Amino acid sequence: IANQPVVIDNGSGVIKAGFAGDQIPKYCFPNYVGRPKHVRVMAGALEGDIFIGPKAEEHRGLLSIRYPMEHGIVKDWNDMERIWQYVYSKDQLQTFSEEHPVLLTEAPLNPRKNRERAAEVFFETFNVPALFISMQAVLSLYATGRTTGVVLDSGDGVTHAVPIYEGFAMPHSIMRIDIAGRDVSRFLRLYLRKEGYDFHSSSEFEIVKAIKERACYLSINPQKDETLETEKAQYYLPDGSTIEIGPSRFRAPELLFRPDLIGEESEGIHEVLVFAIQKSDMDLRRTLFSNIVLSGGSTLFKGFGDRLLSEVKKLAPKDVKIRISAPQERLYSTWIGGSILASLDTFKKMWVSKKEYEEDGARSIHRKTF
């Protein structure tokens, strides 16, 4: 027995937290730690060397930004502990961690040590009554309400196509690549450098991320738009200066469909989806093609749906209906799924209890997650 479970979808880009049963995640904030890089000289300056959440965004020019997660894998565990502490602070969730079961999310095919260390942190440092490390794609499909389909979740750190049959994620058909929104923004930074506009600072990488979110689109025909004269839309920087983007506007999100633009010999996002579908059973391929669900932030590019549909039709067999679903709540689909799962009474039978972790350890999460 414990309080209402707390859902924490910890992405590489933004963490989304709330209590189970809420319609949307009420507590969303970027997943980075900001530390001041300048010299504090006077009394009355900003307090604390660690800035997380909207306090980091308000003073963004003052801070060096560090991302703990990279490609869905926690690289700095002290920063991850700080961020999860902030999730429980008086600014977010206003509650003690010793009272609420947690439903953490983890991207598929992650390292085992990542899940083990996450459970160790959540059971030792935060002393949670219970824990359940879920997978993002199956939760997104639960949020959509369907039971069978393919979830092509493309987040900040990792993109992956996961087919689910009657609620069970087929584990031998999961396709994953590490090219995601952060890679697209790094590519955009490189192209802006090739256009004369140079950004170095970790705080200016957030300006590059904003440029990606604001003025970038996917052209239906890359070669046709490539040869034509560009329009050079102008973007207003935070300081008031302007920059003319031009060809970098559409070649930056092209990285999702062509990783070879950065020398990676990995599949494209359309190839990820189609190979996940074609690696599954021959009986399920028709219903998997007829049920494709987009998710994550990187699926919000202008013209993403039409471009992916064209690519999948190019790769898919003929006489097979293709229906890519792009719900409005793509950013919070996986969190809404975690909230739906945690509301059920069956979730009581799913979590690893605190005593179970105390007596077993990593094996408890290893059997219970799978």
């Binding site: 639960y142 309400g145 039971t147 049959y165 009657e166 609620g167 069970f168 087929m170 584990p171 031998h172 058909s173 599954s280 059973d281 009986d283 399920l284 739906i340 059920l344 069956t346 039978k349 799913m350 059997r367 799978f370």
Partner: protein, 93 residues
């Protein structure tokens, strides 16, 4: 054409196969007509036996699969602890 095969080493299996064929010929010379007849026998029996062999080749894939699949549609062995502890998971729709 009828084939009947029984095999019962530590088990039991009974194949019973039947085929009906209809063809036409032209009667000009008895030796020529007999040779044409035997050629028709050759073609019919060869195609029938090759069809039986092909039907055996596609047994596990399609014919047998209508009764029981080699693996589930998920292509993984059932996690009995999962199905016992957790419900089917199709409560939402």
């Amino acid at each position: 054409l009828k084939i009947q095969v029984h095999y019962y080493e530590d088990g039991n299996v009974q194949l019973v196969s039947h085929k009906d064929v209809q063809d036409s010929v032209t009667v000009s010379n008895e030796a020529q007509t007999a040779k044409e007849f035997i050629k028709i026998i050759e073609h019919a029996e060869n195609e029938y036996q090759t069809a039986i062999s092909e039907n055996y080749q596609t047994m596990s894939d399609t014919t047998f699969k209508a009764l029981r699949r080699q693996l589930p549609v998920t292509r993984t062995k059932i996690d009995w602890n999962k199905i016992l502890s957790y419900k089917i998971g199709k409560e939402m729709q």
